[PDB]
């Protein structure tokens, strides 16, 4: 209520995930190393709400999931819980596991789970078909939202997909493995749409499934949630979110 | 919420809520997608509830002249209700006064007209002709978005159009011909499914959500938000839309 963001210095959790965030590894310092749709959102928020900021990446370079053995979190989620950051500024997918530990902002993009495949010959119509064959290998990225959704799905055959697939390290590793062929990568619609635009030999496996949002992550009891929510709703209403997606997402297709 | 009683603001808006005006008592007068959501929330969270309609039967908007709200929004602000349980569209005017729950459905503004082969391509073209009349429902989200749009020609559309009473009046007027009705995609999709001679005008525009409305500082927001996200994740929201929408 009384507390606002004017003069505050926010620590923002993020990682590279194109086209939401691009991180330059040389030739830059501080905030200048970052660009993309989410960066443009943060810049505008900072101008309108009067805060300064920096970005902090988790050492493990994970988005974050809950380990059922240890009952601990990792990734950006863990950094937020540990007060290393004040908000997670990325395409942070909404899931119930995360919601048990943190809050979300007002959301800015509907998304679904999408499976894609590279391979000549017989192909697949739905991901559970993977369990009854050995032509294709498959995987999800460890400690990221799709893995969490598949592992918590009430049809435990989706847990089988995770347990019996390859645990991919990160998006680059996953895309490199997909491009190697005879592989199904199960991830998120907007991320795959952008990043695989010029992969003319990569195709869909069925339709998208599951419904969720991208939002920012906030700690429970954050004094800044109401302001962030209001300003994100305004960005959506003014058309700013759509304008940024057009600016940053890939167009055409050599294919 | 265990043992608590919630007073829920709502109105009929098919297929989200159907309100029987006879032949029922209490909560059993209500049915629809939103009612199914509330019943499940009640079961899982352990509260009792009742539905309270605003006397003015409006969704609610801010009157610029008086700086007062009406409709369900006003009832919530007056502490007549604890939560608004309906397809409550998200807009910045409402956000200045109330909170929203986690949302459950993307929606846009859509314009429709009776009669095949309309010459209109985009709603702003209405301002430069006099064959068609047009309108929005008063004290409802589309009116608010058009009145607050950056391009004041949208305010012209509202001000120079017909102010419709409610969804029934709007659809009646639409079905009368030579009339462009501007409202919300999912509402129009459901209610006009059997109108084979009603067609879109231009593309959908504006991006918003349906959510529930909550008073600022509600002690119930966290739990409602968590349970609505779980409904979405479990596929319940999609199952309910399939159940209730046509078709
Ligand atoms: Mg949405």
Instruction: State phi, psi for B46 to the nearest 5 degrees.
Output: 85, 20
Closest residue on chain A to B92 (Cα): A234
Q: 3-class DSSP state for residue A22?
A: strand
- H helices then E strands: how many in chain B? 9, 14
Chain B neighbors of A95, CB-CB under 8 A: 229, 233
Sign of the CA dihedral A23, A106, A230, B221?
negative
Contact between residue A118 and residue A179 where contact means Cβ atoms under 8 Å apart:
yes
Closest residue on chain B to A104 (Cα): B102
Contact between residue A113 and residue A193 where contact means Cβ atoms under 8 Å apart:
no
Q: Give the resolution value in Å.
A: 1.2
Q: Where are the alpha helices (DSSP H) in chain A?
A: 37-49, 75-81, 96-99, 145-152, 157-164, 171-179, 189-195, 225-238, 240-248
Sign of the CA dihedral B8, B184, B186, A228?
negative
Please tell us whether the domain made up of B108-207 is placed in CATH 3.40.1260.10. no
Residue A178 contacts by C-beta under 8 Å, 6 or more apart in sequence? A116, A118, A185, A196, A199, A202
**CA A169 – CA A114 distance, rounded (Å):** 18
Residue B216 contacts by C-beta under 8 Å, 6 or more apart in sequence? A226, B98, B99
Shortest CA gap A159–chain B (Å): 15
Q: Where are the alpha helices (DSSP H) in chain B?
A: 33-45, 71-77, 92-95, 141-148, 153-160, 167-175, 185-191, 221-234, 236-244
Contact between residue B183 and residue B137 where contact means Cβ atoms under 8 Å apart:
yes
The topology (CATH level 3) of A1-111+212-255 is D-Maltodextrin-Binding Protein; domain 2 (3.40.190)
**CA B172 – CA A90 distance, rounded (Å):** 46
Q: 3-class DSSP state for residue B114?
A: strand
**How far apart are the CA of A209 and the centre of ligand 1, in A?**
15
Token pair, residue A220, equals 């429970």
**How far apart are the CA of A111 and the centre of ligand 1, in A?**
8
**CA A229 – CA A215 distance, rounded (Å):** 10
Q: How far is residue B148 from each of residues A45, A146, B112, B158, measured CA to CA in Å?
A: 21, 38, 21, 11
Closest residue on chain A to B235 (Cα): A210
Closest residue on chain A to B96 (Cα): A230
| B95 with A229: Cβ contact below 8 A | yes
| B96 with A230: Cβ contact below 8 A | yes
- Closest partner residue to B103 (CB to CB) among A107, A238, A241 is A107
Region(s) of chain A under CATH 3.40.190.10: 1-111+212-255, 112-211
The topology (CATH level 3) of B1-107+208-247 is D-Maltodextrin-Binding Protein; domain 2 (3.40.190)
Region(s) of chain B under CATH 3.40.190.10: 1-107+208-247, 108-207
**CA A228 – CA A45 distance, rounded (Å):** 8
Superfamily of chain region A112-211 = Periplasmic binding protein-like II (3.40.190.10)
Residue B117 contacts by C-beta under 8 Å, 6 or more apart in sequence? none
- Closest partner residue to B95 (CB to CB) among A104, A107, A230 is A230
Shortest CA gap B209–chain A (Å): 9
**How far apart are the CA of B200 and the centre of ligand 1, in A?**
23
- For an interface test with A, give the residue of B92, B100, B186 to mutate (most A CBs within 10 A): B92
| Nearest partner of B225 among A96, A228, A76, judged by Cα | A96
Q: 3-class DSSP state for residue B43?
A: helix
Residue B133 contacts by C-beta under 8 Å, 6 or more apart in sequence? B161, B162, B178, B179, B180
Closest residue on chain A to B144 (Cα): A237
Helices A37-49 and A225-238: crossing angle, nearest 10°? 120
Neighbours of A236 (CB within 10 A): 22
Q: How far is residue B126 from each of residues A66, B178, B180, measured CA to CA in Å?
A: 55, 11, 9
Q: How far is residue A103 from each of residues A179, B170, B172, B224, measured CA to CA in Å?
A: 36, 39, 44, 12
- For an interface test with A, give the residue of B215, B229, B235 to mutate (most A CBs within 10 A): B229
Chain A neighbors of B103, CB-CB under 8 A: 107, 213
- As residues whose CB is below 5 A from the ion ligand 1, the structure lists A 110; B 106
Neighbours of B168 (CB within 10 A): 13
Chain B neighbors of A241, CB-CB under 8 A: 207
Instruction: Examine residue B195 and say whether the peptide bond preceding it is cis (omega within 30 degrees of 0).
Output: no
Q: 3-class DSSP state for residue B168?
A: helix
Q: 3-class DSSP state for residue A193?
A: helix
């Amino acid at each position: 209520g009384s507390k606002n963001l004017i003069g505050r210095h926010l620590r923002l959790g993020s990682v590279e995930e194109q086209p939401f965030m691009f991180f330059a590894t040389e030739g830059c310092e501080g905030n200048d190393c970052w660009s993309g749709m989410v960066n443009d959102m943060v810049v505008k928020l900072s101008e309108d709400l009067g805060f300064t900021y920096e970005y902090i990446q988790p050492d493990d370079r994970k988005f974050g999931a809950l380990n059922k053995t240890t009952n601990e979190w990792n990734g950006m989620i863990r950094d937020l819980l540990d007060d290393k950051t004040d908000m997670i500024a990325i395409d942070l997918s909404t899931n119930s596991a995360r919601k048990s530990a943190i809050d979300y902002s007002f959301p800015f993009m509907d998304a679904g789970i999408k499976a894609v495949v590279k391979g000549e010959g017989t192909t697949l119509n739905q991901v559970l078909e993977l369990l009854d064959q050995d032509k294709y290998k498959w995987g999800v990225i460890g400690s990221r939202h799709p893995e969490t959704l598949l592992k918590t799905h009430r049809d435990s055959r989706y847990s089988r997909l995770v347990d019996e697939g390859v645990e991919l390290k990160d998006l680059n590793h996953a895309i490199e493995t997909l491009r190697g062929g005879l592989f199904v990568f199960i991830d998120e619609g907007p991320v795959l749409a952008h990043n695989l635009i010029s992969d003319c030999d990569v195709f869909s496996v069925g339709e998208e499934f599951q419904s969720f949002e991208y939002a920012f992550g906030l700690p429970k009891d954050s004094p800044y949630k109401s302001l962030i929510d209001s300003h994100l709703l305004k960005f959506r209403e003014e058309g700013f979110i759509d304008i940024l997606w057009e600016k940053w997402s890939s167009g055409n297709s050599v294919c």
